[PDB]
């Protein structure tokens, strides 16, 4: 299973971006997937998760500025970041929910996002 990320950039604060994770395979249809992110020096954490039922779950800071979604066909997941705050700097990846969990998890690139002043 391979995870390729996309979208990041350097936007103002109250910006917008779109991240994309493409999947191999049918992970994206049969398993529930998150949105991490790492700012530098810091633990990284879950921001948003996508389960097979396509409910969604949020961390209290984002929620209502950033939509996770996915498209089975094109075995994408998305994170759309709108309203974006200097907080949400950081590093972005995608994987599997209960990677993090689990030992020895393999991430992917990422996707860099700044928002600056």
């Known amino acids: 299973v391979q995870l390729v990320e996309s979208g990041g950039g350097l936007v103002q604060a109250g910006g917008s971006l779109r991240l994309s994770c493409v999947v191999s395979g049918s992970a994206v249809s049969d398993y529930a997937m998150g949105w991490y992110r790492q700012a530098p020096g810091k633990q990284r954490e879950l921001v948003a998760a996508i389960y097979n039922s396509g409910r969604t779950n949020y961390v209290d800071s984002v929620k209502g500025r950033f939509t996770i979604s996915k498209d089975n066909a094109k075995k994408t997941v998305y994170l759309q970041m709108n309203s974006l705050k200097p907080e949400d700097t950081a590093d972005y990846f995608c994987?599997?929910?209960?990677?993090?969990?689990?030992?020895?998890?393999?991430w992917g690139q990422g996707t860099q996002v700044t928002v600056s002043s």
């Open positions: 994987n599997l929910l209960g990677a993090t969990t689990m030992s020895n998890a393999v």
